[PDB]
């Protein structure tokens, strides 16, 4: 396996509970910021007023080729907002395709619970379609752009490398956090083969689940309600994050697998952390979890299979100690099954635009023990799956 995109290998920092982010510049001269990089929204946006949390942020006056385009933007969702103002301007990656593009940016000058103590990043940079673009599907995402603009080829792959332990900023700062390939994929970043499962519809990164077991037991629902009323795959959600009927199943069954240990509800909750002393995580007594997807092939399927190492998020202890802490990183939707950071951190994941499907592939960072690894296998015949599309 050869790695043909050194460029843009290593281009990502952070961790699933703040985000990962790639660098980026804007205007001219180049203004440098840290993007999160978001598969489940739409908008490039960043900071363009002090903030808190910023260090740095868009100084529009700055920029010689900045264009207003004279129209706000609101964006609130569940636990936050953002609102600005668009524009343009040229638009570049450092560790990316060596491109320059004019893109759309809304300048944020108001926000709540939008940015992120300590996260690094000042602004974000949402990959999916522009059905979910804010104000409207007029404004044409970035990717769009650069596809248009440029030869890059219509897809890029994310490798985002989980540490299996926890990082303080500092650490963060120092630390390579995965790969966002722009235009292709790296074949150092993964192991075995990748499995396609297509893209339902261009809005979100939209996907069919067809089946769900807990250490190889059927969790034995219909397949509707693990799509209900979407599955996405999300860059921007730490959680892998579940309908609610389906983690109340999902965890009845992780706790019955993991009954040899009691743990408190708060921990079932995602709320409180659980901690042991250091280096004796009992990993085997926490079940393995597959998805599986919908296949290119009619009739067949493959599976994703993810470890503890995965769904269990590493966190510092709320005290002074050498324990070994984690929070329990699956958690109750009501907006459908979201597959964010930590089920990603198991995979290299291929968005191939271009195909309208995406591929999944053992990551060359996964976080694993001697004993069990994550893993991607097919092909498995699986009937009547289109019916597993909720409408
Ligand atoms: C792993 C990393 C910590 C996670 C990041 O957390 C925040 C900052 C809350 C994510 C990035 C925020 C959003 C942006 N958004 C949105 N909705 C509609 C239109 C445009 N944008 C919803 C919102 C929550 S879900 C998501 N994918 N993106």
């Given at each position: 396996r050869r790695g043909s995109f050194v460029?843009?290998?290593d281009n990502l920092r952070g961790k699933s509970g703040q985000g990962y982010y790639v660098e980026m510049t804007v205007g001219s001269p180049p203004q440098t910021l840290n993007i999160l990089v978001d598969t489940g929204s739409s908008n490039?946006?960043?900071?363009?007023?002090?903030?808190?949390?910023?260090?740095?942020?868009?100084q529009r006056q700055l920029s010689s080729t900045y264009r207003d385009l004279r129209k706000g933007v609101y964006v609130p969702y569940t636990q936050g907002k953002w609102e600005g103002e668009l524009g343009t301007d040229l638009v570049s990656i450092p560790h990316g395709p060596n491109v320059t593009v004019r893109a759309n940016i809304a300048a944020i000058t108001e926000s709540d619970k939008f940015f992120i103590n300590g996260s690094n990043w000042?602004?974000?940079?949402g990959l999916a379609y522009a059905e979910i673009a804010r104000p409207d599907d007029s404004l044409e995402p970035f990717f769009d752009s650069l596809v248009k603009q440029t030869h890059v080829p219509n897809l890029f792959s994310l490798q985002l490398c989980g540490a299996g332990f926890p990082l303080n900023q500092?650490?963060?700062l120092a630390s390579v956090?995965?790969?966002?390939?722009?235009?292709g994929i790296d074949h150092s970043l993964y192991t075995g083969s990748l499995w396609y499962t297509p893209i339902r519809r261009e809005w979100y990164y939209e996907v069919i689940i067809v089946r769900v077991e807990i250490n190889g037991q059927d969790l034995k629902m219909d397949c509707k309600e693990y799509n209900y009323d979407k599955s996405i795959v999300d860059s921007g959600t730490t959680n892998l994050r579940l309908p609610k009927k389906v983690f109340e199943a999902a965890v009845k069954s992780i706790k019955a697998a993991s009954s040899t240990e009691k743990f408190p509800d708060g921990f079932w909750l995602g709320e409180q952390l659980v901690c042991w002393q250091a280096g004796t995580t009992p990993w085997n007594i926490f079940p393995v979890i597959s998805l599986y997807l919908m296949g290119e092939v009619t009739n067949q399927s493959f599976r994703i299979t993810i470890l503890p190492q995965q769904y269990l998020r590493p966190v510092e202890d709320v005290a002074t100690s050498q324990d070994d802490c984690y929070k329990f990183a699956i958690s109750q939707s009501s907006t459908g099954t979201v597959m964010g950071a930590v089920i990603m951190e198991g995979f290299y994941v291929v968005f191939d635009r271009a195909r309208k499907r995406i591929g999944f592939a053992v990551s060359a960072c996964h976080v694993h023990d001697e004993f069990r690894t994550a893993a991607v296998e097919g092909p498995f015949v699986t009937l009547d799956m289109e019916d597993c599309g909720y409408n």
């Open positions: 460029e843009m290998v490039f946006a960043v900071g363009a007023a002090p903030h808190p949390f910023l260090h740095r942020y868009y000042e602004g974000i940079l500092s650490e963060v956090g995965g790969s966002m390939i722009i235009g």
